[PDB]
């Protein structure tokens, strides 16, 4: 029934990584390989099999653009069979060499396919802004981790950076700023590295003796992706803006520091904080 396929994807989005799966492994869900396939074709509007390995490639495409691994870390990482075939289907999805794909800093959402929900989808809102060059102060440190660890690692990089400064802060600055960077290589254009900078705001307290650099925020077009959810919910909100809202709003984010705008002004209950993801956008 309609309660099945929705629950299958809660398995499948969580088991798009771990089992080396075709529809035979997916045939352990109540019915045969064809009837579970027959039950998917009409309740969704997508056709399951060539979609999933492409969605697993769409899970690998953001791994090909924002994760710091070479071609053969991610050759058969997402349960594939070969690399040249993986390179082949990539041409029919993005029309670009994967060496050329991580050569350019611009990341356009052409072939990324959003994660499917049979239930009700939590749609985020958008508002297109154009921002200003603002000085701040903050430190940087790096990571090399998973797609699900795009905010699991990122929780500590703001917290110990904040609670070192709060030991010598007579105030609480209520506007937070976080900056993600995609910087490729020169030897072979398949790799990159990421330096993440959270910063303290130049606000009503003039004396801010913080280790780091005076960072001028990048100017140009931006988007006010305001949100309601806890820092563990920005984990899936970063994934539903970057897995979905760049394809489903068909937009191409531009080269530069992705401005995060958290709110620490509501800092035990689980805190339902409000946050904006001001992406530097080229519309």
């Amino acid at each position: 029934q309609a309660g099945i396929i929705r629950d299958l994807l809660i398995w499948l989005e969580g088991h798009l990584d771990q089992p080396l799966s075709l529809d035979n492994v997916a045939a352990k869900a109540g019915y045969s390989k064809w009837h579970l396939q027959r039950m998917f074709k009409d309740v969704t509007g997508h056709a399951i099999g060539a979609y999933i390995r492409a969605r697993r490639l769409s899970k690998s495409a953001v791994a090909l653009r924002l994760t710091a691994r070479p071609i053969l870390d991610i050759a058969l990482q997402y349960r594939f069979d070969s690399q040249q075939t993986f390179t082949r289907a990539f041409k029919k999805q993005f029309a670009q060499t994967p060496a050329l794909y991580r050569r350019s800093p611009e990341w356009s959402a052409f072939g990324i396919r959003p994660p499917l929900r049979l239930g009700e989808f939590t749609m985020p809102e958008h508002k297109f802004v154009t921002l200003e060059d603002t000085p701040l102060i903050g430190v940087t440190q790096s990571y090399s981790c998973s797609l699900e660890q795009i905010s699991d690692f990122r929780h500590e990089m703001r917290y110990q950076f904040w609670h070192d400064f709060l030991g010598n802060a007579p105030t609480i600055p209520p506007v937070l700023y976080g900056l993600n960077e995609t910087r490729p290589s020169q030897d072979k254009d398949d790799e990159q590295e990421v330096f993440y900078t959270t910063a303290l705001a130049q606000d009503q307290a003039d004396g801010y003796v913080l280790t780091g650099h005076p960072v001028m925020l990048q100017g140009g077009e931006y988007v006010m992706f305001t949100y309601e959810g806890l820092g563990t919910g920005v984990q899936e909100f970063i994934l539903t803006v970057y897995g979905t809202c760049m394809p489903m709003l068909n937009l191409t984010r531009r080269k530069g520091q992705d401005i995060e705008r958290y709110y620490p002004a509501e800092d035990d209950r689980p805190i339902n904080l409000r946050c904006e993801l001001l992406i530097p956008i080229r519309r």
Partner: protein, 96 residues
Amino acid sequence: ATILAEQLEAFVDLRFDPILLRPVDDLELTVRSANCLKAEAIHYIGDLVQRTEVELLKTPNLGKKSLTEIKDVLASRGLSLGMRLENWPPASIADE
């Protein structure tokens, strides 16, 4: 005195399967075999080993490959279909 007293008492005195701890959602079965069984209000493995398979699989959320995980899991641990237990439920047992 007391420290001397107690040291004198050297000579005056001196001469259950752990996977049955878990509910139905806590066994890591196949594509739909673990989350579907809780919908029949079966909140435990001990509550699920008390019944037979004839009154489970026919609900049209429960399927033929939501059926067989009662056949092999009890065979890997040595239980029966309809086994009523004495002390199955834990201290604070509930549902989600």
